[PDB]
């Protein structure tokens, strides 16, 4: 088990802890804080009017590309124990006189918004006054943890049921709740990048 070392470098945690005050205002040592930073997944998500549309119907073609961290890192792991703050900005041409009152609700994951009594906690924000919507859906499942993406989720967790009254285009972002981490560690996926037609 002979393991050697080159360069007789000084204390590595003497140069970097010094060579961030020269190069990096921030000094990152954890990784979980990424899940507290909202970076977007979609940029249009053109919605429809007076149709409560769940979010799982969106975030299923979201955890398949890694356009954020909450997905790119998913593969590394399998489980999670927290809530997913979903922030929704508006870009719709609301140069009109109507009153948009985009409304959010709570629905169990993998329910289709048609078999639901839409009551309970909610939220209503007006884009004409505040072009955001910054809910903090908590973790109200009944299990210690949850597989990242399986097909047996007939209510093992909570979700959004985003409601609106107008035909809208939204920007979106999602990081995770103050108690949102992942479970086991596993290996890595395969990545594709740039493509060159010919």
């Amino acid at each position: 088990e002979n393991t050697i070392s080159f360069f007789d470098s000084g204390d590595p945690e003497r140069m970097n802890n010094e060579a961030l005050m020269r190069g990096c205002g921030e000094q990152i040592v954890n990784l979980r804080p990424l899940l507290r930073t909202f970076r977007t997944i979609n940029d249009n998500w053109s919605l429809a009017a007076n149709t409560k549309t769940p979010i799982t119907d969106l975030t299923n073609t979201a955890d398949a590309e890694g356009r954020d961290y909450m997905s790119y890192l998913s593969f590394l792991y399998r489980f999670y124990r927290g809530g997913r703050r979903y922030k929704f900005f508006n870009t719709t041409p609301l140069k009109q006189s109507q009153t948009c009152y985009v409304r959010s609700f709570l629905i169990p994951r993998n329910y289709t918004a048609d078999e639901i009594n839409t009551d309970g906690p909610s939220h209503i924000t007006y884009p004409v006054i505040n072009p955001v919507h910054e809910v903090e859906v908590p973790f109200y499942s009944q299990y210690r943890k949850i597989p990242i993406a399986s097909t047996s989720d007939k209510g093992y967790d909570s979700s959004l049921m985003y409601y609106t009254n107008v035909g809208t285009q939204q920007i979106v972002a999602r990081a995770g709740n103050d108690d949102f981490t992942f479970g086991w560690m596993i290996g890595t996926p395969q990545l594709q990048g740039i493509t060159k037609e010919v």
């Binding site: 802890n17 005050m21 000094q27 040592v29 954890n30 979980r32 804080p33 103050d178």
Partner: peptide, 17 residues
């Protein structure tokens, strides 16, 4: 030295809180 004061105390922020 601020963030270098928290990284050394291992405060509950860096770990994701």
């Amino acid at each position: 030295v601020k963030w270098f004061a928290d990284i050394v105390g291992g405060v509950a922020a860096i770990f994701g809180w």
